[PDB]
């Protein structure tokens, strides 16, 4: 299923995943495109941070969902 990870500048990174994929896999495919280690990325899904060890299904990330990639220090 195709989701969009949007950066702060609104740049859209398409990503193909499965419901049982860990959120960590989404971070791996963002790393392939952007160069950011997964542990340096923060992914926001409608206002909420996510646990990388949970799955796309746990968080109800579906086809056409849009996640936001935060790349700033806390």
């Amino acid at each position: 299923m195709l989701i969009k990870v949007k950066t702060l500048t609104g740049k859209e990174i398409e990503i193909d995943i499965e419901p049982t994929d860990k959120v960590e896999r989404i971070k791996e495919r963002v790393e392939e495109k952007e160069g950011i280690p997964p542990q340096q990325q923060r992914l926001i899904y409608s206002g909420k941070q996510m646990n990388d060890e949970k799955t796309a299904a746990d968080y109800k990330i579906l086809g056409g969902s849009v996640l936001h990639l935060v790349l700033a220090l806390r």
Partner: protein, 249 residues
């Protein structure tokens, strides 16, 4: 060692100028750094924020507290600083560095290239380090002297073994401390060993060399031998030219 000074100057400028800071945090990787348009980048941010407030059913202000904004200095995490520094060194009118296009080397290949660098040429290595969940750049300026000093540049979100460090704090405290090929090689080999040497991690990566700030329990054990290594030759006058152009925003 004029290259380190250029990176310091960039770190200090990008900490106080929104224009230079949106360059530091840019992700239009196909556009070379000298040719980026900070006005358009900041507008892109405002458009994204405004769209996202409408998408989330909340105010612009609420989205800005979560995602950031175009009117606030943003401190980059490690991979963004590492990409932007590669661009400072390498970008020009016919080249625009992007992580996804670069050829990665295996550790074996990198160890050979590094053990055999010509003395009169400058090199720069971008690293993603699987075990540390980290990214950083190593600058190998041309040298006359028997063996080469190198300089590590970074910032870090601080969720791993290493703690949080701002690009500018790093640059102005510890980036000019030289490290040998031995020190570097030791890290890449050692990080996959049974025992890791936390002292050596603190020496390379911690801004106070303080081993007590590290968290050995955050090592990502199954990735300790996964790196991405991208090694380039660079010409010092290209870095200097990018900095002179940037110095006119």
């Amino acid at each position: 060692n004029p290259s380190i000074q250029h990176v310091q100057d960039f770190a200090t400028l990008s900490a106080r100028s929104l224009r230079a800071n949106v360059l530091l945090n840019s992700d239009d990787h196909s556009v070379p750094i000298h040719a980026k348009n900070p006005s358009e980048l900041l507008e892109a941010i405002d458009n994204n924020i405004s769209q996202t407030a409408q998408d989330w059913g909340v105010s612009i202000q609420e989205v800005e507290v979560i995602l950031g904004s175009s009117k606030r200095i943003i401190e980059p995490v490690a991979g963004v600083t590492a990409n932007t520094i590669m661009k400072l060194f390498l970008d020009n009118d016919i080249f625009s560095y992007s992580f996804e296009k670069g050829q990665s080397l295996s550790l074996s290949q990198l160890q050979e290239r590094l053990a055999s660098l010509p003395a009169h040429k400058n090199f720069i290595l971008r690293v993603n380090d699987g075990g540390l969940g980290h990214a950083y750049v190593i600058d190998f300026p041309a040298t006359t002297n028997p063996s080469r000093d190198a300089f590590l540049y970074q910032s870090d979100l601080g969720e791993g073994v290493t703690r949080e460090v701002r690009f500018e704090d790093w640059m102005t405290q510890k980036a000019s401390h030289p490290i040998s090929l031995d020190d570097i090689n030791t890290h890449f080999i050692g990080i996959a060993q049974d025992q890791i040497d936390l002292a050596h991690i603190a020496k390379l990566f911690d801004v106070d060399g303080n081993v007590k700030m590290l968290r050995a329990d955050h090592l990502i054990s199954h990735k300790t031998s996964e790196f991405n290594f991208q090694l380039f030759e660079y010409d010092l006058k290209n870095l200097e030219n990018n900095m002179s152009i940037i110095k006119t925003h």
